[PDB]
């Protein structure tokens, strides 16, 4: 007898109402897997009689230990997330509301919830899997029209290299920004406000540009802003048509209790 897998899903909602009230012959578990993308919010609706261990009592993924942590709140790993656990009577029947509010800046997370009906026989189970994670890892130099500068933002957004508790594997912690090198134009590399960003990533980007002599560059300032440690570099007139890519590794930077950074990979295109 194999553990049977069922799957339900709605529009940005996980409805387990009147779906967990029967008894199969073998062990079964109905799954509701969701992946929020464009700041969407999720609702989890199930019958009140069911025992629900969600939100504050969920199983969250810990990238530091590469496993899951039992009986923990998800706000302890994605603080910008905020929810509400209320009691509503949906479709006449008394239901349980598990409404989560996902901001745009909310850090990536990966947790599951157990919806178990109280019975002496535990053959039926319900599970909701939440996978908040960035899916765009390859963008270009965002030319700011106001300041006439190119920006490769790794301090936030999709290319965020900030230590996050998101479910990313070893060969998935690769974000990259591509800056088509325009001569004599300012280029910004916004990085998270971290202690080691200036201590190791700044020497890392310096050594990448000095080895190639034909690359005409000039570091102007390292400006600390509100949240971004912007590296201000202007590339001068280049001679040979070349191509360069530099790696600013923060994937190994550990952050308690589970957060891990990303490896920045800026690709420079020298074309006339």
């Amino acid at each position, epitope marked *: 007898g194999t553990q049977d897998e069922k799957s339900v899903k709605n529009i940005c909602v996980c409805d387990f109402t009147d779906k967990l009230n029967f008894l199969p012959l073998e062990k079964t578990k109905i799954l509701c897997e969701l992946k929020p993308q464009y700041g969407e919010d999720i609702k989890i609706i199930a019958n009140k009689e069911y025992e629900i261990n969600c939100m504050n009592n969920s199983k969250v993924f810990c990238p530091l230990k590469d496993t899951f942590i*039992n009986n923990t709140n998800i706000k302890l790993y994605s603080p910008k997330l905020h929810f509400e656990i209320k009691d509503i009577t949906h479709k006449g029947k008394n239901a349980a509301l598990y409404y989560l509010k996902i901001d745009e800046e909310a850090s990536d997370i990966f947790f599951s919830c157990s919806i178990k009906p109280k019975q002496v026989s535990g053959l039926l189970e319900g599970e909701v899997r939440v996978n908040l994670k960035k899916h765009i890892n390859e963008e270009y130099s965002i030319f700011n029209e106001e300041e006439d500068v190119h920006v490769c933002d790794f301090s936030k957004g999709n290319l965020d290299i900030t230590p996050s508790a998101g479910f990313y594997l070893k060969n998935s912690r690769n974000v990259s920004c591509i800056y088509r090198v325009i001569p004599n134009k300012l280029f910004l590399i916004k990085l998270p406000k971290l202690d080691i960003v200036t201590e190791k990533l700044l020497p890392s980007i310096v050594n990448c540009l000095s080895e190639f002599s034909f690359i005409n560059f000039t570091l102007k300032h390292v400006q600390e802003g509100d949240n971004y440690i912007s590296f201000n570099v202007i590339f001068g007139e280049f001679k040979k048509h070349f191509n360069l890519a530099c790696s600013l590794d923060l994937s190994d930077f550990q952050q308690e209790p589970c957060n891990l950074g990303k490896t920045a990979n800026i690709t420079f295109i020298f074309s006339k």
Partner: nanobody, 124 residues
Framework: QVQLQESGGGLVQAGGSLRLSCAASGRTFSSYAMGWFRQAPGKEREFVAA????????YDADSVKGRFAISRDNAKNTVYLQMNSLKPEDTAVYYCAAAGVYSGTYTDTEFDYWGQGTQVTVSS
């Protein structure tokens, strides 16, 4: 959604070695955690070994501590089980299992998708 298939099983002598393999299909392999189980004919299904998502954390049982080592290859979409110094009571069908959520449990509860299982018999 993921399916599994075991291979490399058969017959072996005591103290030998077997390279058990389990390939997968469907959903991304590197996003699920793998683990081997076995069921001796008559006895129940017991835990053997387990490998994490990236492959850093290995979880083993007492009966096969040191002797059996589990390894995974995310690139090949395949998990392996290197069996060394097979005692004669290892005669069992060895099952391959995948778990979407995995908290290091030593039971079959977290594993959702299962394989078929190959026969491993050791004489002495």
């Amino acid at each position: 959604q993921v399916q599994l298939q075991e291979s490399g099983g058969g017959l072996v002598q005591a103290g030998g070695s077997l390279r058990l393999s389990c390939a997968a299909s469907g959903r991304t392999f590197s996003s699920y955690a793998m683990g081997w189980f076995r069921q001796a004919p008559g006895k129940e299904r017991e835990f053997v070994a387990a490998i994490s998502y990236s492959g850093s954390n290995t979880y083993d049982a007492d009966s096969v501590k040191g002797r059996f080592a589990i390894s995974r290859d995310n690139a090949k979409n395949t998990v392996y089980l290197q069996m060394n110094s097979l005692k004669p009571e290892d005669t069992a069908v060895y099952y391959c299992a995948a778990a979407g959520v995995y908290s290091g449990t030593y039971t079959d509860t977290e594993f959702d998708y299962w394989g078929q299982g190959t026969q491993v018999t050791v004489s002495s």
